[PDB]
Design a protein around this ligand. Structure first.
Ligand SMILES: NC(=O)c1ccc[n+]([C@@H]2O[C@H](COP(=O)([O-])OP(=O)(O)OC[C@H]3O[C@@H](n4cnc5c(N)ncnc54)[C@H](OP(=O)(O)O)[C@@H]3O)[C@@H](O)[C@H]2O)c1
Ligand SMILES: NC(=O)c1ccc[n+]([C@@H]2O[C@H](COP(=O)([O-])OP(=O)(O)OC[C@H]3O[C@@H](n4cnc5c(N)ncnc54)[C@H](OP(=O)(O)O)[C@@H]3O)[C@@H](O)[C@H]2O)c1
Lengths: 488, 483, 489, 483
């Protein structure tokens, strides 16, 4: 419906343009074609949205949970009617294949539903008192106005996980989508508005991170920021947020290890590895970005892995439902992947396959004979350039897996219960998966990292933990003597 | 003479720089204590890091064993800790006795719970998938503490943090280093493996900042001034380390018209003025319903008048000892000087000699007085009269702080409605503002900080969740589609 | 729904059918004895067939992901939303409930189904610390198996659906036998389930006599658990019969809840509340305020205001309009029992302040003062509209009277004093207690249940889940070790 | 030896006694009470009188008592080990383990006493506070067996005491001195009178009186399934709840990828420790055909090495004697059936006095008594299976479902088998009788209901109590004529 409606901000129940009126033109990464004019908001716009959410907060937090749940179920109903719209935009604006965006839309449905389901069930605790005649309990309360700042790779699911769960437990929301995915953010507003949430409870401000996002992060009426993006941005936001003592949730990068032992079905290992390391062009935080394989099956693994990679079809992702890979999000991502490929070649790496690019498209590029000094070993490679590392034993497997600043997810493939468990215990990561892909994700599990991959957990009640606080309350039923004045 | 404790060894700071600490009671010398630098902090940090794996991997029952031994040791040093809390900290007998009893309970509480911190088994939305969540320790944890309750605050942090398999670098407040050194004495005698607990005595902005900015420190739990906390949270950003921040308070104590007024004044005096008002959850702003204010004010001032201020070493019946240092006396004078100049009525107190200060009580206060706007960490207190419960709440919430708070009343509806409406991390009906148990979530909102400490809440602060799955079936994948 | 058009049948393994024996009886309205429908009179073979159907379906139903059972329950919720007018009409004409009563039960039933659906994916086990090195130690939740659901006639929809929806949610299958006085409500439940398309045998309905059909369920070896709401005696018999095959039970038995009123209350408000709490659904509520206890200082004005509001209650054909206050008792036997209660009180010198008449199945609320502990209406559950008011001198006395009963389901105190409220809440012996509200407060996710003769276990949300699942400790050991025998080694 | 009722050691009301002898050589051990119903009634009435003051002190006081009881137990360790051997037939190593685990049980109960939490709920109603308290059930009956009399009794007693129930304890008639020593320990620990009561007597007399009494709120029982069914039915008269820890016939499944020698060594410990007289003994050994030959050879090899002797002679005795001659008779019955049905007796069968040499059978089928019944003694069948499906079918072909184990290195096979085997507990690559102080221990099917260990014990002997506070007034629907 972009052919009949202007893309706008959503502030205090109203779709409207930024106060300056300034806009930019969102183009498709597929063919550079125009998608829509979109707001280029500034600080006054963020402030208006923040004030709207702050003024809406008390009423929203004080209604019974069941009523917030009702609003989220209504949102879910609206989402279901809007699925194709979301799929269409995820593809032409974000470059996602039919399969990727179908996955994203199906998961988003589950996220909204999960948030609705859990709203009424987030519990506090009744405690024993060490004192006589004392009732001692612990309540759960909303943090307040919550800033939601998101990336471009899974813009729908990542945004809605944060928005629906944050809204469910009685916070209001100021939402700033990634500048490469603004129409997705706008469709989210369309959804919310049609679900008729009270004005100010949810607000959309479209504009630059360093301007609109920074305002959200430094404003005293914002209680908490939940953020998903680059670790460098996370560190910046964490620093900025300190000024007003607001808490943060930081879902940052990853360089996930996929560990492949010698007792596996090697053909299966390769099929799983291709999917985990290259789905959505590798632009996934929990992409299998460093493939680690036991020497005993390495030659056969490498051959199969490449075989299946050679079958990957790259095309305009609107062409049909069977396209494997779309383009990268912009030209900067292409240039960066060229730097990764060139650095790996210069250092003596063997390029097994791929390496061409055109427009924003970038082929899978696979390397062996890499060492720890390679950029594609030291940095997050948010794209389809992937190293394969050969190791002699499980000790080395772990050493390499852990030889990174990151610590989001990870996986081992093996049929041996002992090796599976020891490697799982020893790999330093927020999440781990035995015999599955690295990017496994469920709507209600604690999703998050350690080390440079961030802080906190999201999904279900973990999302609730991030944006509530505990409130110890006592009642004393007896009177007592006090120690001062002692002369009594 | 006092030393650091690093990797199982009591040792001098690497520069040998020492410093003479004195007693707030009479200026007489107490000890020679380290003046450590960044290099010392790093040595403790590297120790803790290298002890971490062995410490975290032993079964929890083992860590609990160490803590029970520590409890055993602590119980033998009770009077030592009491003496130093009085001599170095200026605490009265009753105050330090209370602190030593609470400390006994804190260490015991952490031992009790070590074996019992659980993860979760989850339902999977997928077929043939086991899906569970483990608890894992954060790593090496910096522990930075204040001077007012240096023993109990330090131990709640040290003991609970150790319990769940974290190693510790500890830096006590510069005015209470000997309390710190005794803590290391107790830990050493409990025989915890080397590097698991490290003490470094040095300046906050040098040693503390090293802990806060170091790459191998996973988490810092901190108690102190709100401004210090904001600084610490900002420095922590660089390494994405997490923080627990227990900062200031300006706790409201609300008194309604249906109370036992005499009882209310007795409660108010203890809550507002215990330990000379140098308590984070001290009742720092007293708020009273107009219908009982005159009688309440007369009674409160009457019991304040009965307070005995003296050398806390003299005997067990001393109500108030001195403030910790001359900077605190200077600050209290500012609060009084400001209140007088804004038209406050000074009902009693204000006398100060050396570090001693007689509780100064004000009425005819308005929201612009520094003693209404700022945390008053000492014995200077406003009483404010309100007309109804709405104004009581408005005044209670008219602060940047939000640590604790309390209401005195026999009406169930007024009590609950006021508990609910008051913006604080903790609240208490018919008791003091500074109630504290070993295992309850202790902490604030607004400028009073972030996180909760006490029992399993301390465990939450210094561990993380780790989602682990096992998939028991193989499946087909969407790429490549030509398959 | 046309009452003359209804073909009422069992629902077993996916199909509506007649009892194997072809037997039936006629269900009549308690309002005027009008025929409602012929309904099955099933026997043991029908119960066995349902049980076998539930058992055979168990593994496929338990092993699917929780999310898939929630989907079924959401679908059930969708169907129920369409069937509301139908459910309300049968609750009124078959159960004798007023419009306002049945509207309330249907609204609550919708919340109960939704609640079970919401929680299905979120019932968690535990990851534990091991005292042994190299050991992983966890606790899974597993469904109990086939569960028998045996229900009463007073709130037949909401009590049935609480039990059924939560039980199904966590992967048990169900064999359900409604109260013989409310069979059509059970049949409409099976219609809802059938329309929601649950797999065959997951839910079964058998309409028949408790001592026949009900007993087969309780004694059968393929039944893992029985959840039962009814009379304390029936419960005690069920608990005994269940021991044979070591199946567990949930027992929601009678109450005789106290409503304690202190001297500091708004007395007029206390009176209005007490009328509602003591007499809604003609007192036919387990958590009805069955023994009103008031403080001497407000007793006289309280009794005046309370009797005044009772006098205002409109007794009438509950089908007539929406504003009828009270309808008939469920049947003639209930009227006769209430007559015994009234007669025993009059005979013992109790003072009857109002009511005590009755016509057909309709009974006029009878209020007594000047009673003592030997009165039957103080010693027994009075499941109908006969209520004693006891006057007390102080809070200690209020508590002693409150606790002087074999029962222990719920309770309430009215007071504005936080200390008296909490101390009374603490001293009263009941599974549930409400400060400044009615005795029969109930939410979909709270633990509902009693102590003493009022039963065992709790229902509502995760507590229903606790009843019909078990904990399963599983360990993995990652190191080999030496063993102490043979020591020669 | 006497009863312990309301703070006093005393002989039975009737004065009736009996002589308990050693299973090892028949010699006299002690005279013990033969109590009757009046004794059980005196104990119950005492527990009941004592309940309210015990349930209402703070949890921390009860924990304190348990910590006291723990220190007494530590002093009494050798006395317990001695009696468990001479009265129980236990070897040194067995009774050492029992006492070591009993120490952990008492400690564990103490640790958790302060931490049993209720819940704060969201209300679907406005202005409503909704919470759930934990309340102790009341007077609790504790009825126990003879095979692990100390640890089994102490798990039940310690945890039941912790959360504020009082106890009436009737031990197994073949292990009464262990029950008396437990009353010694409790008395020395100084629990308030009536809180713990010991009544030594006949199960059908004393036990039944306990199970049927109005003032007993709950019964926790460990024993034979038939007994459990008896108790469950008698319990119904007073609607008291029960915990039933009944028999087991646990499967030990061995797959073809194991270290066969290790599997054999594990099986021998698992199947025959304490003469196989353990609920969770590996009583049905199931081995994959591809390693069945080697496994059976190694297994019999290690069984032959078992040294059977007077358990009092030294610390390296593997097996002592069965508890009484009736057990030996039952074991002969089991062997006589298996021989009659075509079983091959590979080793053992010999018996003298109460001693019995472990009898191992192969060529068995499902109709053998040693496959259909719990074999609570040293007769064990080995069954060979052709695949995992068949392993599970046999494993599940029993009325019992207590524990179970699989030995394998394949993650898939271990998990698939774990979830398929119908039991309350399951262990991968370990013995079937793993037990920790705080885990949920209990079975399904004929093996019992409920769970014991730490907070699971707490769930069994407490109830949830929903309480609300409604803060607003409202209009009610009747009388409808009322505005
Ligand atoms: N605690 C609670 O939550 C709660 C809630 C509501 C009501 N109640 C209690 O329910 C009671 C009134 O209901 P009611 O007259 O329906 O009670 P009931 O006579 O005990 O009947 C309850 C159910 O048990 C069945 N039944 C009867 N005998 C049986 C047997 N030997 N084996 C198995 N099932 C058998 C009945 O079938 P038939 O109809 O064929 O007899 C009925 O479906 C009151 O005491 C009330 O307090 C309790
Ligand atoms: N699930 C577990 O955790 C577990 C652990 C260990 C053992 N067990 C089981 O316990 C069984 C062997 O022990 P056992 O020979 O002592 O079993 P038992 O014959 O049932 O005796 C157990 C206890 O119940 C008492 N008792 C007997 N009849 C009673 C009655 N009618 N009412 C009340 N109490 C009565 C007994 O007293 P008297 O001695 O005077 O007869 C004894 O103290 C085996 O099945 C074993 O598997 C289970």
């Amino acid at each position: 419906d972009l052919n009949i409606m202007k893309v706008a901000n959503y502030i205090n129940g109203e779709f409207k343009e930024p106060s300056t009126g300034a806009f930019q033109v969102k183009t498709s990464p597929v063919d550079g074609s125009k998608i829509a004019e979109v707001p280029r908001s500034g600080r006054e716009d963020a402030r208006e949205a923040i004030d709207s959410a702050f003024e809406a907060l008390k009423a929203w937090a004080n209604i019974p949970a069941i009523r917030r749940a009702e609003y989220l179920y209504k949102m879910l109903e609206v989402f279901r009617q809007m699925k194709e719209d979301f799929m269409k935009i995820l593809t032409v604006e974000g470059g996602g294949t039919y399969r990727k965006v179908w996955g994203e839309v199906v998961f988003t449905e589950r996220l909204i539903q999960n948030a609705a389901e859990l709203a009424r069930h987030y519990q506090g605790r009744v405690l024993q008192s060490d004192s006589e005649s004392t009732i001692s309990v612990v309540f759960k309360r909303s943090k307040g106005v919550v800033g939601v700042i998101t990336p471009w790779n899974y813009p729908l699911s990542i945004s809605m996980k944060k928005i629906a769960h944050t809204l469910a437990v009685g916070n209001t929301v100021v939402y700033k989508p990634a500048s490469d995915t603004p129409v997705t953010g706008w469709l989210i507003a369309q959804m919310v508005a049609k679900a008729g949430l009270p004005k100010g409870v949810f607000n959309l401000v479209i504009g630059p991170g360093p301007v609109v996002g920074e305002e959200i992060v430094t404003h005293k009426r914002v209680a908490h920021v939940t953020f998903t993006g680059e670790s460098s941005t996370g560190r910046e936001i964490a620093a900025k947020a300190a000024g007003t003592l607001k808490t943060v949730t930081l879902e940052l990068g990853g360089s996930d290890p996929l560990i492949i032992l010698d007792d596996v079905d090697v053909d299966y290992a390769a099929r799983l590895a291709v999917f985990a390391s290259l789905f959505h062009q590798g632009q996934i935080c929990t992409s299998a970005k460093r493939i680690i394989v036991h020497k005993a099956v390495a030659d056969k693994f490498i051959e199969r892995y490449v075989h299946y990679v050679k079958m990957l079809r790259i095309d305009d992702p609107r062409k049909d439902e069977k396209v494997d890979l779309g383009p990268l999000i912009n030209e900067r991502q292409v240039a960066l992947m060229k730097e990764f490929v060139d650095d790996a070649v210069s250092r003596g790496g063997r390029l097994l396959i791929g390496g061409r690019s055109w427009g924003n498209f970038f082929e899978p590029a696979i390397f062996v004979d890499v060492d720890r000094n390679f950029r594609i070993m030291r940095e997050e490679v948010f794209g389809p350039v992937r190293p394969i590392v050969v190791v002699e034993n499980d000790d080395q497997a772990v050493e390499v897996a852990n030889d990174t600043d990151y610590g989001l997810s990870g996986a081992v493939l093996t049929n041996n219960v002992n090796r599976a468990f020891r490697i799982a215990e020893a790999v330093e990561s927020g999440m781990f998966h035995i015999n599955d892909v690295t990017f496994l994700e469920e709507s209600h599990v604690p999703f998050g990292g350690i080390k440079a991959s961030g802080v906190g957990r999201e999904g279900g009640e973990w999302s609730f933990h991030e944006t509530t606080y505990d409130r110890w309350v006592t009642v004393t039923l007896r009177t007592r003597r006090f120690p001062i004045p002692s002369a009594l």
